[PDB]
Design an enzyme around this catalytic site. Structure first.
Site, PDB file in Angstrom:
ATOM      1  N   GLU A 148     -76.765  80.588 -27.404  1.00  0.00           N
ATOM      2  CA  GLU A 148     -76.488  79.169 -26.487  1.00  0.00           C
ATOM      3  C   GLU A 148     -76.430  79.474 -25.002  1.00  0.00           C
ATOM      4  OE1 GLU A 148     -74.756  75.713 -28.654  1.00  0.00           O
ATOM      5  OE2 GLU A 148     -75.817  76.274 -26.909  1.00  0.00           O
ATOM      6  N   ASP A 149     -77.758  79.521 -24.609  1.00  0.00           N
ATOM      7  CA  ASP A 149     -78.003  79.695 -23.135  1.00  0.00           C
ATOM      8  C   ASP A 149     -77.229  80.837 -22.578  1.00  0.00           C
ATOM      9  OD1 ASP A 149     -79.610  77.618 -23.810  1.00  0.00           O
ATOM     10  OD2 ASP A 149     -78.171  76.199 -22.899  1.00  0.00           O
ATOM     11  N   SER A 150     -77.476  81.903 -23.052  1.00  0.00           N
ATOM     12  CA  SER A 150     -76.946  83.263 -22.576  1.00  0.00           C
ATOM     13  C   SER A 150     -78.133  84.249 -22.608  1.00  0.00           C
ATOM     14  CB  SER A 150     -75.697  83.645 -23.462  1.00  0.00           C
ATOM     15  OG  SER A 150     -75.130  85.102 -22.750  1.00  0.00           O
TER      16      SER A 150
ATOM     17  N   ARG B 223     -86.148  73.322 -25.747  1.00  0.00           N
ATOM     18  CA  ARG B 223     -86.697  73.017 -24.525  1.00  0.00           C
ATOM     19  C   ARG B 223     -88.160  72.642 -24.347  1.00  0.00           C
ATOM     20  NH1 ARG B 223     -82.204  75.862 -22.577  1.00  0.00           N
ATOM     21  NH2 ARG B 223     -80.314  74.554 -22.755  1.00  0.00           N
TER      22      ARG B 223
ATOM     23  N   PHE C  52     -73.148  77.938 -23.073  1.00  0.00           N
ATOM     24  CA  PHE C  52     -72.870  78.915 -22.178  1.00  0.00           C
ATOM     25  C   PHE C  52     -73.844  79.043 -20.591  1.00  0.00           C
ATOM     26  CE2 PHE C  52     -71.887  80.585 -26.366  1.00  0.00           C
ATOM     27  CZ  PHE C  52     -70.587  80.731 -26.272  1.00  0.00           C
TER      28      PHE C  52
END
Ligand SMILES: [Mg+2]
Ligand SMILES: [Zn+2]
Ligand SMILES: [Zn+2]
Ligand SMILES: [Zn+2]
Lengths: 45, 46, 260, 115, 459, 58, 51, 67, 404, 59
Positions: free
Chosen positions: E204-206, E377, I41
């Site tokens: 999750e975008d980490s 994306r 996040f």
């Protein structure tokens, strides 16, 4: 005399570098203030 | 007690006491910089 | 229900790297040895700095952190020194640390390159690698006419898990099963992949056939040392360290069994 | 603000045991070894060495959390055997393997240095 | 038009629009008319011959600059209102004879299509390979990226300034950065990133960072904070003055200790200062008697060191002091990182070099991202950048990731990568750092230019 | 030397003038509002060459 | 209707698969500054005293 | 702003390679051949020498605070 | 404690959590409890309120806890489910060709809280003892629930003909007595859909049981993914030369068809449809031709994907992406629409000065005939920015109207 | 903005349309065809000022 396609990529970017070597990145801000001091203020007075 | 300051233009170590306008006696510069303290500061190389 | 009988065969040994092969051992023992080379091999490195004067363009923390990453010859001294935690001395001593000194000032007009050669130590055995008598000297900071850099550093004994500066390795090429016989990997197009340097296969083939009764064996290694510890000393210090942890663990175990 | 000391991963805290044994009640002849200030370096080698013992029915390791530096090792053995005995032999076997591997390395280094 | 192209009475900034259907002919000399240059085009050929490019190469000797190029009638400043009556050519290739003539009556040509991009968007490599919003989110992050905002940062006492320890120029760069001076003042570091799911701490975008790299100065930065203060002599009723306060004369003296201050009332450089500490001891005369303390304390949760101290006089002739505090900010869990394609994320956890994966050789990835961020994306540029970077590092050059360049595609990059002993598609076999066992899925790994954002967790 | 400039310094704060967009002047623009008593509306923001008063919109 | 409140906190979030869905990772700083008013009883008089 | 000491990825010393790297480039050497002569094989170390920007050389153009 | 994130849209945006103290300075959440908050996040911040009373403490412990908030009355289905990695790996874990050795299993079983400590008899005892992924998932699933679902790739012509109860592709998920008899799990079987294994776990079994069912699926699968591993790169965005040739030919035919449609309308050979203007008819025909080409090209790409492709592993499991994203990354992005219509003539009868006047063709009106991998042209890039900018504007404007 | 050289250049080459961030009309915020070569179609904030605050092109 004519720029061949193989030499184009070098010519276009060369022309661009000359632009940024004379005008710059904020030329629109300097030219604006310059013309204001040279002409606008003298004209407003 | 001495509070020696440094200049920005001449880099001359001049003494300046309180209640005294800031001005370099050697060059007249009005901006003064303080000198590194003498305390022992530790730096862990991490 | 017992240990293995591993073997060793060194194919290359130099002052920078060592390439060996371990056979007849489990993958876990081979991996842990790889982890010890990086994280559980003691070494000497700067861990304390006191800047007395710094007129350079780089602040103190930039220099201190930079000094720590300078490798110091610690072949036979690291084993004699002790950890600051176990030493009964004060903040510092010769038995738990190695004092350093630096005093440089750029008086000339040319830029003065403050290098590791200027780090003067009290112990002649523990010195910068590049200063050991080709490779040039490490660059700490450049100085301008009128600038000065004077400090007093202290090195300590530590390992990688505490900080990367205590890592004596510059790369650990751990490999096993060059030919994909155990099929631990699944190449969707094995022909598009290259051959490993330890591979034994014809160019016409891509990967070895599957071996159901096969087990990971013949682990290859290439321990490229930073310069502090010789490539061979890292291995010996590693196995001794890994053997010490298990020995201490066995003692604590017996201490718990008899208490229960 | 909260960066924990780096040495906190390897140094044992005062009053903290290096290893704790807890008998598992789910199945018989099983135990849980909670070792403090360790990582996967020891769990795997002990795990692998335990699987090779035929009297060991279950041998595994886990890290409850990476930020922590403790480890939990589960050991299940036959009724005639004991898990503590397996954890001890697995260490004794690993020690001998490293001692033999260490000696055989010095010889290889010596043979290579000479010719 | 002939007069404007010769720098005649009509200047280049003059716009001349000849509406044909409507017989109006509108000429403009007012200011604010946004315009851009373009290469004039003859019947079917350009006016920028080879003799010009020759003179432009020796620009430092024969003082032949852009102005001499415009005066030669080769370039023309075209405004938006005139573009409607102008027929452009994206590249000279469109001027050649084709099997089916599209226009055949061109009158202008573009210098380079990449010039349509701004400053924060030109730094993006392969922006024509990513989803447009992503290129937009990056343009908003490039302004938040740490680096060296200016060379003379040691003299400027700014209130907020973030300086990167070891800036690096992007291995995968565009030919426009040479003009933005990003090569001289970069704002990021080339990182060996591996797009894989390792323990799930990068979801999750980490991202997962290498603790050993951080220990060697990976993305490490310093935080400069300047505190200003002045003693006002507004009137004889009450006058401020810098002086070491005292517990017996001052009234509003906090429980904090003032020993770090000097007799002048200002702290000295090189001193370690924590939260709630005092850096400027100022007292104001009252109408704990006859004077109240008005000292300037430090912001909470700073734990910095005084870099330097300045004392001067403001316009009112009063004493004016500036204290620039320095605090080293190490990238830790919570700090935000972002590539040049909108791939933003916080460092989920910091794994050591021993716990991280590695290839056949001892190459651990400095960063690990979750591949789930690519499909939604559709940031293919992040993959090609990771590829062109692997070719540039192994080849010894700087990748040319100009947006619109047909001479560089994914196939050519793949073939060049197969010559250095690597998979042509960038994939590479990794080994689990905890057990040493190989990873069934050949991971994708390579150098990628990442950036650190000022939005830290400590702040 | 790399500082491009283009900004001022007021009380020690580096201030930059943001270019403000505006509708062109002295030009005729015929629009059409959907909800209004007029079908088509032709306006022209007029201002002398040397601006001295606000824009007299007709 | 909506107002500021005490005994609160705020910071960036981070993934952690090693936690249950009902668990949240609270730092030691926020936990040190925040407190819970626990009543004293003979069952917890010992623990609360040591704290 | 100055060449780091170690490589962030592996840990190989690179601080002693910047000056030698520049001395080779001026000798008409290629960036690749130069990095090979210095003993930089992994693309991680080659990144440090090929992507570094020597900014300290520009910071030394400003006079110091003390003479 | 009460864990909240703004904007608080639904009642699950403030759920009760149990505290876990550790060194670092970030609020670490479980990854499954991030869907209710809609929190990623990417620098998000989430507040934490600590009740200072036993009454409030007990109240939150029984009404707002995460376990009791798994199922929502908004749509009588769970809001939190398996997530990015745990959903793609569990897909590649429950497959038919997934076999675990004696060592790997003990590593996974060690991460199970609901484990009786008895290793199950492997599905293969000779020549080498091997456990299967489903044989381990059976231990993850609690109680003796029963469910039936269908994998995303479940063909419609399978439940009619033979092999309906023995699927070749390992579809038709069938859980019986708490054992994964067969089937490949995905979002349809573990996600936030109705009737999934979770929704059935919360109904038949309590909330505490479902809580452990969530954690176990995350720990085990993540520890196994550590072995299998997942990635994504250029190798997954590339297609064989045959696929590209079929796509370019498909697009070349679409552009030719539109040219014929334009010639028809230009020669007055096109009549309007009932209820639409001639121009609307022309745009509808063009939009149809292009939309058909995009679908045809998208299918050709999906067929060209291998079982090892990672993009397919994402769309199949539904963790992230869809078949459209792949078609845009490989074959063709498609037509860019502004306000539900093609790129309008911003200039005088033109979309850009590089095109002729009155050019309703595909390239002039915003047909992105290139893929994100092959690279977009300048015109196609500018047009693509419009389709994107329109999304940002809407996302930035609806917040006020929707919030009001 | 003195956080990085890119921000400084962008801020010095920034535009602004006085339509009002309060406005909810998407017509002025949309990327018009006339932003070609004169303005960056990508460089623009994603908050409540989309399309209004622009950034000049390189040339
Ligand atoms: Mg977010
Ligand atoms: Zn002076
Ligand atoms: Zn000692
Ligand atoms: Zn390296």
């Amino acid at each position: 005399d004519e720029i061949t396609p193989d030499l184009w990529q070098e010519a276009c970017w060369i022309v661009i570098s000359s632009y940024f070597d004379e005008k710059g990145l904020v030329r629109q801000q300097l030219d604006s203030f310059d013309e204001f001091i040279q002409m606008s203020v003298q004209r407003i007075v | 007690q001495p509070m020696i300051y440094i200049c920005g233009e001449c880099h001359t170590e001049n003494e300046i006491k309180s209640r005294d306008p800031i001005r370099c006696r050697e060059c007249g510069y009005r901006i003064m910089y303080k000198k590194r303290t003498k305390r022992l500061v530790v730096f862990d190389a991490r | 229900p017992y240990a293995n009988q591993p073997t060793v065969r060194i194919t290359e040994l130099t002052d920078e790297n060592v390439k060996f092969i371990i056979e007849n051992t489990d993958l876990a023992v081979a991996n842990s040895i790889r982890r010890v080379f990086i994280a559980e091999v003691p070494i000497i490195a700067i861990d304390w700095v006191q800047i007395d004067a710094n007129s350079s363009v780089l602040h103190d923390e930039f220099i201190a952190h930079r000094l720590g990453l300078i490798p110091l010859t610690s072949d036979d001294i690291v084993d004699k020194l002790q950890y600051s935690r176990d030493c009964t001395c004060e903040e510092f001593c010769p038995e738990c640390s190695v004092e350093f000194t630096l005093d440089v000032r750029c008086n000339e007009d040319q830029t003065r390159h403050v290098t590791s050669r200027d780090l003067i130590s009290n112990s002649p055995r523990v010195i910068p690698v590049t200063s050991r008598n080709e490779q040039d000297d490490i660059l700490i900071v450049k100085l301008r006419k009128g600038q000065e850099l004077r400090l007093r550093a202290y090195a300590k004994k530590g390992f990688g898990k505490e900080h990367a500066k205590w890592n004596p390795t510059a790369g650990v090429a751990f490999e096993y099963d060059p030919d994909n016989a155990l099929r631990h990997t699944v190449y969707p197009k094995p022909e598009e992949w290259p051959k490993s340097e330890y591979s034994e296969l014809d160019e016409d083939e891509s990967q070895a056939p599957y071996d159901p009764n096969g087990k990971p064996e013949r682990f290859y290694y290439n321990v490229e040392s930073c310069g502090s510890l010789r490539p061979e000393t890292i291995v010996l210090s590693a196995l001794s360290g890994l053997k010490k942890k298990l020995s201490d663990l066995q003692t604590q175990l017996s201490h718990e069994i008899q208490s229960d | 603000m909260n960066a924990p000391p780096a040495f906190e991963s390897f140094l044992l805290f005062e009053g903290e045991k290096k290893i704790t044994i807890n008998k598992d009640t789910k199945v018989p002849n099983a135990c849980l070894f909670t070792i403090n200030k360790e990582d996967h370096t020891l769990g795997n080698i002990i795990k692998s060495q335990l699987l090779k013992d035929p009297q060991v029915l279950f041998a595994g390791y886990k890290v409850p959390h990476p930020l922590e530096h403790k480890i939990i090792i589960r050991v299940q053995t036959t009724p005639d055997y004991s898990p503590q005995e397996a954890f001890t032999n697995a260490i004794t076997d690993l020690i001998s393997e490293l001692s033999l591997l260490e000696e055989r390395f010095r010889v290889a280094i010596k043979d290579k240095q000479e010719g | 038009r002939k007069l404007r192209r010769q720098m005649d009475i009509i200047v280049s900034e003059v716009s001349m629009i000849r509406d044909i259907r409507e017989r109006e002919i509108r000429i403009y000399t007012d200011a604010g008319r946004i315009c851009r240059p373009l290469l004039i085009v003859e019947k079917q050929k350009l006016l920028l011959k080879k003799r010009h490019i020759d003179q432009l190469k020796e620009r430092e000797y024969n003082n032949y600059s852009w102005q001499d190029l415009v005066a030669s009638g080769v370039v023309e400043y075209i405004d938006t209102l005139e573009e409607e009556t102008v027929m452009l050519a994206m590249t000279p290739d469109d001027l050649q004879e084709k099997e089916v003539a599209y226009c055949s009556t061109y009158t202008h040509c573009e210098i380079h299509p990449s010039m349509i991009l701004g400053v924060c968007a030109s730094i993006i490599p392969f922006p024509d390979h990513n989803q447009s919003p992503r290129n937009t989110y990056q343009s908003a992050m490039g302004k938040q990226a740490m680096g060296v905002y200016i060379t003379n940062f040691h003299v400027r006492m700014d209130t907020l300034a973030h300086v990167l320890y070891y800036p690096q120029k992007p291995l995968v760069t565009t030919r426009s950065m040479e003009y933005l001076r990003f090569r001289e003042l970069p704002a990021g570091i080339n990182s060996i990133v591996a797009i894989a799911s390792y323990t799930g701490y990068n979801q999750e975008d980490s991202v997962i960072m290498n603790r050993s790299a951080v220990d060697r100065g990976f993305f490490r930065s310093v935080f400069y904070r300047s505190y200003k203060e002045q003693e006002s002599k507004k009137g004889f009723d009450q006058e401020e003055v810098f002086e070491k306060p005292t517990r017996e004369t001052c009234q509003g003296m906090r429980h904090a200790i003032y020993d770090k201050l000097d007799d002048d009332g200002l702290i000295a450089p090189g001193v370690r200062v924590s939260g709630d500490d005092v850096i400027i001891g100022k007292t104001v005369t009252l109408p704990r008697y006859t004077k109240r303390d008005c000292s300037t304390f430090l912001r909470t949760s700073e734990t910095g060191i005084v870099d330097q101290v300045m004392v001067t006089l403001n316009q009112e002739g009063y004493k004016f002091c500036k204290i620039r505090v320095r605090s080293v900010r190490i990238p830790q869990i919570g700090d935000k990182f972002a590539s040049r394609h909108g791939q933003k994320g916080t460092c989920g956890i910091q794994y050591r070099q021993e716990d991280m994966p590695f290839t056949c050789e001892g190459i651990t990835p400095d960063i690990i991202i979750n591949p789930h961020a690519i499909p939604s994306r559709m940031t293919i540029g992040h993959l090609i950048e990771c590829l062109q970077g692997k070719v540039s590092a192994n080849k010894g050059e700087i990748g040319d990731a100009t947006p619109f360049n047909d001479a560089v595609n994914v196939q050519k990059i793949s073939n060049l990568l197969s010559d250095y002993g690597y998979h042509l598609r960038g994939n590479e076999v990794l080994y689990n750092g905890f057990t040493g066992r190989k990873i069934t899925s050949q991971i994708f790994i390579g150098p990628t230019y990442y950036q650190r954002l000022k939005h830290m967790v400590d702040d | 030397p790399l500082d491009p400039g283009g900004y001022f310094i007021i009380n020690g704060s580096e201030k930059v003038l943001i270019a403000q967009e505006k509708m062109a002047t002295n030009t005729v623009y015929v629009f059409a509002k959907k909800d209004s008593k007029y079908a088509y509306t032709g306006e022209c923001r007029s201002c002398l060459e040397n601006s001295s008063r606000p824009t007299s919109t007709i | 209707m909506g107002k500021r409140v005490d005994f609160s906190a705020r910071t960036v979030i981070t993934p952690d698969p090693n936690l249950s869905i009902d668990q949240v990772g609270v730092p030691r700083s926020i936990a040190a500054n925040m407190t819970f008013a626990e009543i004293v009883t003979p069952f917890n008089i010992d623990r609360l005293q040591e704290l | 702003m100055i060449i780091p000491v170690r490589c962030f990825t592996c840990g190989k010393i690179v601080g002693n390679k910047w000056e030698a790297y520049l001395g080779l480039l001026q000798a008409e050497y290629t960036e690749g051949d130069a990095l090979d002569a210095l003993g930089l094989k992994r693309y991680c170390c080659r990144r440090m020498l090929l992507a570094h920007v020597d900014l300290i050389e520009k910071l030394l153009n400003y006079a110091p605070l003390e003479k | 404690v009460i864990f909240n994130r703004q904007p608080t849209l639904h009642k699950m945006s403030m759920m009760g959590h149990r505290v876990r103290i550790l060194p670092w300075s970030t609020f670490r959440l479980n990854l499954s409890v991030t869907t209710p908050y809609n929190a990623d996040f990417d620098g998000d911040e989430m507040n934490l309120h600590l009740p200072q009373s036993l009454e409030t403490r007990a109240e939150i412990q029984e009404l707002a806890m995460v376990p009791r908030m798994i199922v929502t009355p908004q749509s009588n289905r769970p809001v939190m489910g398996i997530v990015q990695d745990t959903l793609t790996a569990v897909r590649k874990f429950t497959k038919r060709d997934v076999f675990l050795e004696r060592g790997e299993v003990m590593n996974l079983l060690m991460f199970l809280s609901t484990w009786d400590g008895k290793v199950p008899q492997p599905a293969i005892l000779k020549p080498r003892p091997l456990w299967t992924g489903k044989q381990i998932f059976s231990l993850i699933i609690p109680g003796h629930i029963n469910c039936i679902r269908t994998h995303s790739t479940h063909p419609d012509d399978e439940d009619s003909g033979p092999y309906k109860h023995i699927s070749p592709g390992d579809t038709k998920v069938v859980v019986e007595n708490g054992e994964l008899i067969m089937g490949i799990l995905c979002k349809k079987s573990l996600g936030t859909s109705a009737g999934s294994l979770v929704h059935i776990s919360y109904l038949e079994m309590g909330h505490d049981i479902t809580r452990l069912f969530y954690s176990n699926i995350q720990t085990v699968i993540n520890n196994w993914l550590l072995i299998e591993g997942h990635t994504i790169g250029i190798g997954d965005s590339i297609a064989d030369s045959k696929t590209y040739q079929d796509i370019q030919n498909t697009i070349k035919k679409a552009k030719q068809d539109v040219i014929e449609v334009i010639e028809k309308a230009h020669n007055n050979e096109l009549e309007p449809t009932p209820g639409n203007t001639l121009r609307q008819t022309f745009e509808n025909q063009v939009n149809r031709i292009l939309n058909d080409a995009r679908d045809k090209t998208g299918s050709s790409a999906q067929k060209s994907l291998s079982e090892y492709n990672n993009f397919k592993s994402m769309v199949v499991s539904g963790a992230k992406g869809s078949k459209i994203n792949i078609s845009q990354v490989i074959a063709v992005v498609g037509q860019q629409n502004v306000e539900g219509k093609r790129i309008p003539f911003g200039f005088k009868h033109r979309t850009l000065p590089h095109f002729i006047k009155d050019d309703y063709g595909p390239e002039s009106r915003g047909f992105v005939e290139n893929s994100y991998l092959a690279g977009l042209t300048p015109t196609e890039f500018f047009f693509h920015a419009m389709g994107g900018r329109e999304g940002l504007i809407d996302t930035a404007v609806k917040t006020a109207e929707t919030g009001y | 903005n003195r956080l990085t050289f890119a921000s400084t250049l962008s801020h010095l080459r920034r535009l602004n349309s006085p339509i009002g961030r309060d406005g909810k009309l998407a017509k002025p915020r949309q990327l018009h065809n006339t932003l070609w070569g004169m303005v960056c179609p990508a460089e623009t904030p994603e908050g409540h000022a989309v399309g209004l605050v622009k950034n000049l092109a390189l040339m």
